[PDB]
Design a binder for this molecule. Structure first.
Ligand SMILES: C[C@@H](O)[C@H](N)C(=O)OC/C=C/Cn1cnc2cc(Br)c(Cl)cc2c1=O
Ligand SMILES: [Zn+2]
Ligand SMILES: [Zn+2]
Lengths: 401, 401
């Protein structure tokens, strides 16, 4: 009952085809989940004071060659040509963000500059390694890059760490393992630069009261990182989050700002993603909930249904009210037994089934059944609407009484 | 002047650069506009009963050969390869939508099925023909495909036409010219199918009293199209909308549903895009308004400012209250003359400037000035918040009077 590929078919969320290896066809209901996840991340972007931008899908290979990634990663990049020029389909958003940073003179007053994007990335991953939503060729990162001074690093990493635990707690993930990857054998910068950079990550973690462990020698050539691994309800580990310091890319791409002493300074860059791949995170969630998505995420939140034809216009009014309240609602007005309707929508993991018999219509009430088979009895319509709105707005993991 | 390139730079909306010809980098404020336009389109998708999906970025050339796309467009497609297979970066969303349609058995009871996407598309346009946001290589099409029966064509084409005029009138575009583009020299489908399709589109225009001219030979290879051209305040013509009737691609991609009888039948497909390209439409709006976007589209909707440090706390509170009412708002507490502050936000095209002096703090009021220079008086805070909320939620073209 926790295979995201079977559940994804059963709930009509997505499909894959050999015509587009590792690129997801999002169906209506799956795209609803994705969009709702995007809304959630955007709420955190506002709360943590990020800009949100959007970069193009391709950029001249010439620019990618300047980044220092081209040699290590050419074989995993899609390329395409036009008019004697070769373009890379972007595998990451960082160089694009630096291009945005480079427009307009920046000063120290603009820092820290926090730049997020739901970045549509492609990697030419071997087809034999592809698997459902979790190993794909086309993915979307909840990405951001922070441009800051050396003095601002700790405070910026501190905020990233808070954002990580904040976001994972929303989905019920409270068991998190954290690993700090230290200086590799081949690296840029001085040993003193590495001492200070590793300490900044370590102290920011201490300032959040987070125990962690080292992954010795596993840092990037361009700086140390923290990785965050969450545990699902089956105690399976999923590495999702990354906070990566980068002392190389800004210099490579001629990024600079006017310092307070009026000299040209090169900013430090922090790369961070919390969920990682949105597609992969939806896979993880599907398995974690076994398809019983929390109401805020559920493609269809409520189905309103009549026992007989006599309650059809009451169901229509109630459905319009729920629609006006911002709820994802459908009316099931089929000439079918109420038990048939409940079973179908239970199998589809609809959080709430609002049942209207003659007694409900006559009292201006509605009978509420949950997808877990709980009869909550019959309740005043406006009180039920208010409770559903609260469960949705608060992104609650739990259903009503 | 109302050059979208200049306004785009001045208001920090977007940029373009030679490393990515005809591809847009949206900066924070431009991306806010884009996303509000998406919110608007999604409101119409809901109103007109469309699903929303997302297709893959690329698909195997083999599939594009089956549609007729390879024969009809290879020199304008970007291609890439992996593991000895060639992929086309999608120039259109229709084949992907049919792939989604083909998952799971469809019956007549599922039709009309209206499937929309903000489709990321790419066309390898000659670089010399590119200009601004109006002719680009990478774009986002407000696309949809309607799968319906032959009997449903008249109602579904009518609804598309209604949707076009509805959406254009939101932006104040009332001068619309219409052409019916008929069978091109290179095409698919029989002359009897083209007779039927062309006649269906002609009747729809006649029934709506839409005058039109035939545009001979300019149909799509798969079917005829109604083309909608809007006129801006300079009386320039911009072709934006298209409604196309297709009796050929569904058969080529093995689309079918079980009819009201029990026989296997091929659905009709209607293609339509209204804004055309999100990027181009933003370009057109930018010029139409000269950067004075209606409040609902404006990157920053309200700026709240003090006279002295005396009113700082009141201003921060009012700002929080506008933020709670859903308004894009910032506070300006700087130690600058009120005329300097007001000018700055007028230059940035902020719709409303809210000013708090001692008399305003005392009375629970706020002084409101519009970016055109009208002083609306000191007014009760909650009456202003309510009036702004209505202006925004109703997507009004005019500010308060
Ligand atoms: C958080 C982001 O802002 C950051 N840029 C990132 O992707 O970090 C997560 C992992 C990075 C490691 N990685 C993994 N796979 C790759 C595949 C390709 Br192709 C290229 Cl060019 C680079 C890489 C690459 O750095
Ligand atoms: Zn990055
Ligand atoms: Zn189409």
């Amino acid at each position: 009952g926790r295979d995201h590929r079977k559940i994804g078919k059963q709930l009509d969320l997505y499909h894959m085809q050999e015509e587009a290896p590792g690129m997801v066809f999002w169906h209506n209901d799956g795209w609803t989940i994705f969009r709702e996840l995007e809304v959630f991340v955007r709420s955190k972007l506002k709360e943590y004071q990020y800009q949100e931008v959007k970069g193009p899908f391709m950029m001249d290979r010439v620019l990618w060659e300047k980044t220092g990634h081209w040699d290590n990663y050419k074989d995993a990049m899609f390329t395409t040509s036009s008019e004697n020029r070769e373009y890379c389909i972007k595998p990451m958003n960082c160089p694009g963000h630096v291009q945005i940073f480079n427009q307009g003179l920046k000063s120290y007053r603009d820092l820290p500059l926090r730049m997020a994007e739901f970045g549509s990335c492609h990697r030419n991953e071997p087809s034999g390694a592809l698997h459902g939503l979790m190993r794909v060729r086309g993915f979307t990162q909840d990405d951001a890059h922070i441009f800051c001074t050396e003095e601002q690093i700790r405070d910026e990493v501190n905020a990233c760490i808070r954002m990580v635990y904040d976001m994972y707690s929303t989905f019920g993930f409270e068991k998190i393992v954290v690993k700090l990857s230290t200086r590799p054998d081949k690296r840029i910068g001085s040993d003193e630069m590495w001492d200070r950079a590793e300490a900044d990550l370590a102290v920011a973690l201490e300032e959040n009261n987070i125990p962690f462990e080292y992954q010795l020698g596993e840092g990037a050539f361009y700086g140390p990182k923290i990785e965050f691994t969450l545990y699902d309800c089956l105690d399976r580990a999923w590495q999702c989050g990354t906070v990566q310091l980068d002392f190389s890319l800004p210099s490579r791409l001629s990024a600079s700002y006017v310092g307070e002493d009026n000299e040209r300074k090169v900013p430090v860059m922090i790369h961070r993603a919390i969920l990682g791949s949105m597609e992969r995170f939806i896979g993880i969630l599907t398995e974690e909930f076994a398809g019983f998505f929390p109401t805020w995420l559920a493609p269809v939140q409520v189905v309103v249904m009549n026992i007989t034809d006599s309650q059809s216009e009451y169901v229509n009014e109630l459905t319009q009210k729920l629609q006006n309240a911002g709820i994802r609602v459908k009316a099931d007005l089929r000439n079918e037994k109420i038990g048939f309707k409940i079973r179908e929508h239970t199998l589809r993991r609809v959080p709430y089934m609002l049942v209207c018999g003659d007694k409900e219509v006559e009292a201006g009430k509605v009978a509420v059944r949950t997808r877990r088979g709980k009869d909550l009895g019959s309740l005043d319509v406006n009180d039920v609407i208010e409770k559903l709105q609260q469960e949705i707005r608060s992104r609650s993991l739990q259903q009503l009484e």
